[PDB]
Amino acid sequence: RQIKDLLRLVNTVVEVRDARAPFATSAYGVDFSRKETIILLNKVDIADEKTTKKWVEFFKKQGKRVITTHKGEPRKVLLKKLSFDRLARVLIVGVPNTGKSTIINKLKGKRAGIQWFSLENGVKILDTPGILYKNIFSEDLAAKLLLVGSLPVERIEDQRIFERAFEIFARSIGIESSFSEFFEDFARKRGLLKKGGVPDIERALMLFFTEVAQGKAGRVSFERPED
Numbered sequence: 001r002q003i004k005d006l007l008r009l010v011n012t013v014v015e016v017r018d019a020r021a022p023f024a025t026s027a028y029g030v031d032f033s034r035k036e037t038i039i040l041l042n043k044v045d046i047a048d049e050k051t052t053k054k055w056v057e058f059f060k061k062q063g064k065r066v067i068t069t070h071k072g073e074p075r076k077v078l079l080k081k082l083s084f085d086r087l088a089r090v091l092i093v094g095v096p097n098t099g100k101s102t103i104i105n106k107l108k109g110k111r112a113g114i115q116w117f118s119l120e121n122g123v124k125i126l127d128t129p130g131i132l133y134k135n136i137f138s139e140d141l142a143a144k145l146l147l148v149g150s151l152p153v154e155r156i157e158d159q160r161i162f163e164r165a166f167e168i169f170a171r172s173i174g175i176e177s178s179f180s181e182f183f184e185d186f187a188r189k190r191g192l193l194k195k196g197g198v199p200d201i202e203r204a205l206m207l208f209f210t211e212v213a214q215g216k217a218g219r220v221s222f223e224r225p226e227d
C-alpha cells in the first residue's frame with residue numbers, strides 16, 4: 001500500500017534481488033506488471049558464479065529483463081546495463097537488505113517528501129527505495145531470507161528454520177556435520193560463552209547468519225533454477 005502509492009509516481013521499476021537467492025528475494029505480492037520492470041541480480045561478487053549464470057539464462061527464457069551487478073561495479077557499467085529509456089521515471093524496489101540504498105547512492109553520486117534525482121540524460125529516479133515485506137509461511141523461504149539477511153534472527157521463532165538455513169548452507173558449500181556440533185564449535189571458536197562458561201548457541205546463530213549474509217563464509221548461492 002505504501003509501495004502502491006509510490007508506484008503511481010513511476011513508469012519503471014528496478015527489482016533489486018540477491019543473486020544467491022533470486023526466488024526468495026523476488027517481489028512476489030506486489031503488482032508491477034503495468035510498469036517496465038528490470039530484474040537486478042545484486043551481490044554477484046559473493047554468489048556462486050555458475051549458479052548466477054544459470055539464473056540469468058532462466059529469467060531470459062521467461063522473456064524477462066534481467067541484469068547482474070555488485071557494489072564494486074563502476075556506475076557507468078551499471079547505467080550501461082540498465083539502459084533506461086528517455087522517459088523513465090524509476091522506483092528502486094526490493095525486500096530488505098538486497099542493496100537498494102547502495103545502488104541509489106551509486107546512481108546519485110555527488111548529486112542533489114520523496115524527491116527525484118536526475119541522470120545526466122534527464123532520467124528520473126526516486127531517491128528512496130520501496131521496501132517490500134512478503135508473507136512467510138514456508139520454512140524454506142524464511143531460511144533463505146535469513147541466509148541473505150533479509151529476515152532478522154530475532155524474528156525467527158522456530159528452531160527448524162535455523163536448521164533448514166544450515167542444511168541449505170552445508171549442502172551448497174560441502175559441510176556434512178550436524179547442526180548442534182557445528183554451532184557448539186562455532187560458539188567456542190568465536191568466544192561466545194554464556195554464564196557458567198556454556199557456549200552461547202543463540203549468539204552463534206546470529207553472528208553466523210550475519211556473516212553468511214555478508215558473504216564472509218565463502219562464495220555461496222542458496223538456490224538454483226533446477227530446484
Ligand SMILES: Nc1nc2c(ncn2[C@@H]2O[C@H](COP(=O)(O)OP(=O)(O)OP(=O)(O)O)[C@@H](O)[C@H]2O)c(=O)[nH]1
Pocket residue numbers: 042043044045046069070071072094095096097098099100101102103131214215
Ligand atoms: N558483498 C556485497 N555486499 C553488498 C552489495 N550491495 C550491498 N551490500 C551490503 O549489503 C548490506 C545492506 O545493503 P543496503 O544497500 O543497505 O541494502 P538495502 O536494500 O537498502 O537495505 P534495507 O535498508 O534494509 O532495505 C550492506 O552492508 C552493504 O554494504 C554487493 O553488491 N556485494
